[PDB]
Write a protein that binds this ligand. Structure first.
Ligand code: 68G
Ligand code: 68G
Ligand code: 68G
Ligand code: 68G
Lengths: 175, 175, 175, 175
């Protein structure tokens, strides 16, 4: 396991703010977005198609434990949380990424917003991918990938074990 | 072929306005509704969950042809069009029901709003079912049925060969 | 004070279901609708422009008191409440009509959905208007009238003391 | 007239892409946003409340005329256009900023999206303010200012002669 690095080569700091930006793409960062109409909670996660939109920042925290370091390592379980002062819907749910485990979850389940910090579906690992400062995210339900989503076909995050669907990302420090 | 009858026993007249109401249901009539987020045209068709809502009016017209008669007969191809002065979106498409034949069409294709009068996918038949006063609609892609749709699970219309999904309806003359 | 009558001449029953339908109009009954974008709660009340839409039913209950009668009388304070099994937004607020008394209320304040049963802003009286089975509604902030609202200019309910803005209605028993 | 300068001291070039960002603000750049519900075209312009969102790019072009120079000068009439491949609504109107001159225009009219290049209401000037690198925009209806708008109070652009409402901005060169 190695220090995960941001897009400028510096190791990623626990609790600090990063945009997640899909490598080698015309569109922008990852953002919350409704994936169902009504009810529209929990929200899904999509890549915006808009080129200079950087994403909504997130920060990473270890779970469990790791009373050692202010730095994020690969292959080690974290929670991923959106960081926003404003959050005008879905307020009874958290901002933690989580894999949909509801009774309507799809065979490749959507990644939603609203996990509980300790529940197994909220745990991710960051792993090295082939590509400088390029990574992938995994979960116990599969690797994070995409399919075309409901907003003009923008990529929507799901968990999948189809290798051709993996989402490759880099982490861009919020400055 | 028999004369199709409205919910008061009278023959259904070509060009007059009817609500299409699902038989044996605590919900209301059939209404346009978005089935996709963006783009949201073409519109789909959904049964409203609200009990007192009668649906949006439609009318029926022979296609092709038929100049013998004022009435609508079973087993005979017609167009079905919503009738509404107010139509604030998807103005580039008609108000004619049609089966989705677009490149993204599901295996059980949605019934969408926007057909061309002579197009094959715009032709329906009315057929008798058991009782009442009760009918079904058929197209060359299958019988009109429903699945749970994006508006709190409200039934959404589709063309299907699954007999368990048949939507049984009555036609309520508009005042 | 007199028994208020429905559109079919029968006195109005406490707790029973009625559509409120503006007299002498091309459009339909009164319905909840968002009057602001975000936040969209509390909901406003508009007249739908769609001709055969009857409104969302309401029922009237005395407040205070009146331990006497199953019948609604003029000039006597009631609450007005929307009656719907389904209510998919604004759930932390009631379905009682009320006059907006928030810090952003307009000089002619909107009628909103969400009053508290005993608060003074949730109290209405039904009064006779010139017209058979025609009434108006009043509140301590003024008579219920309309202005053009945000949905294609559909009439939105407000409280006003401008006599030219009064909304004249009839009560149509839900059958 | 002076050469207008971007937030890095370089002269602003006609036709190149800039974000317009409000000076001294915890919110982001300027973006199209619906200001009316239905119809929702034309779009208005709002400052986003989200801190890391840079706004949607614009570019500037002389109108009329001026073929001496590549750069944008103060005190000189230009068009301002949003620049975006993705434009999923209001396609019947341009991406040009304009002052609302429609029959429903407020006393301090909204700045809307959809002007005609030669139309008077589509002409702006850039003027210096105090520091930085800081400017304002003016039109023949007044200076561009803001009021709290329909998206959680986010500032919405309008033309005004109220000096207390002046929006002070910098121009951030798009990468
Ligand atoms: C429900 C709540 C949400 C959506 C519907 C939606 C939804 C979305 C969508 C609109 C976009 C991501 C997809 C995309 O790239 O779109 C690209 C941009 C467009 C397609 C053009 C503008 C779309 C407008 C804003 C929506 C019009 C609503 C239509 C008319 C309603 C149709 C309803 C039918 C059922 C009839 C988006 C984005 C987006 N969202 Mg979103 N998002 C949310 C929720 C949140 C939310 C709580 C947050 C934290 C403040 C949040 C953040 C956020 C950020 C930072 C960003 C982006 O940069 C965005 O990519 C962006 O482009 O915004 C313009 N979102 N969020
Ligand atoms: C886009 C355009 C459309 C929808 C999104 C939509 C959509 C819909 C839906 C709302 C309903 C059918 C489903 C139902 O039973 O719901 C029942 C009632 C509700 C679910 C509660 C009210 C929902 C409100 C009105 C909309 C809120 C939208 C949310 C906040 C957007 C968030 C989106 C996320 C992605 C962020 C409906 C109906 C409905 N429609 Mg619809 N419909 C259209 C389009 C039309 C249209 C052109 C017409 C001809 C005038 C038209 C008519 C029409 C009629 C007559 C009726 C009904 O009686 C309805 O069943 C009804 O209950 O209206 C309240 N519609 N139409
Ligand atoms: C937020 C929640 C709501 C709206 C936005 C909205 C809103 C509304 C509106 C849509 C209509 C009343 C005004 C009217 O006559 O419209 C007439 C019909 C149209 C203009 C065409 C269809 C409009 C579609 C459904 C909405 C598209 C959403 C657009 C694309 C979003 C634009 C967002 C911008 C910011 C970018 C309406 C009606 C309406 N509502 Mg509404 N209503 C609600 C809320 C409720 C609600 C909780 C209930 C109890 C189930 C409820 C009931 C209800 C009933 C029974 C009825 C009607 O009969 C309605 O008049 C009707 O025509 O529905 C189609 N509504 N409700
Ligand atoms: C209709 C079309 C539009 C809106 C409703 C709307 C609307 C808006 C709003 C949402 C924001 C600006 C205000 C803001 O800061 O909000 C900040 C973030 C939020 C308030 C949370 C997310 C709200 C979600 C995305 C929409 C939910 C709609 C509700 C559920 C509808 C209920 C309606 C009731 C009547 C029933 C916004 C932005 C926004 N827009 Mg917008 N915008 C448009 C149109 C466009 C448009 C054509 C473009 C060119 C691609 C476009 C771009 C654009 C960009 C780049 C950005 C931003 O960065 C934004 O500030 C942003 O934060 O996006 C999330 N927009 N655009």
């Amino acid at each position: 396991r190695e220090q995960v690095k941001d897009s400028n080569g510096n190791p990623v700091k626990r609790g600090a703010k990063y945009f997640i930006q899909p490598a080698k793409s015309n569109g922008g960062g990852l953002v919350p977005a409704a994936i169902n109409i009504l009810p529209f909670c929990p929200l899904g996660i999509t890549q915006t198609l808009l080129p200079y939109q950087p994403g909504l920042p997130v920060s990473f925290g270890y779970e469990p434990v790791i009373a050692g370091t202010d730095y994020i390592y690969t292959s080690t379980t974290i929670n991923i949380e959106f960081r926003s002062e404003i959050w005008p819907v879905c307020n009874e749910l958290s901002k933690l990424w989580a894999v949909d485990v509801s009774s309507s979850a799809a065979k490749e389940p959507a990644i939603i917003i609203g996990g509980e910090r300790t529940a197994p579906n909220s745990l991710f690992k960051i792993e090295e991918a082939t590509g400088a400062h390029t990574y992938k995210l995994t979960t116990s339900s599969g690797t994070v990938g995409t399919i075309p989503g409901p907003w003009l076909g923008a990529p929507q995050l799901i968990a999948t074990n189809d290798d051709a669907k993996t989402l490759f990302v880099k982490f861009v420090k919020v400055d």
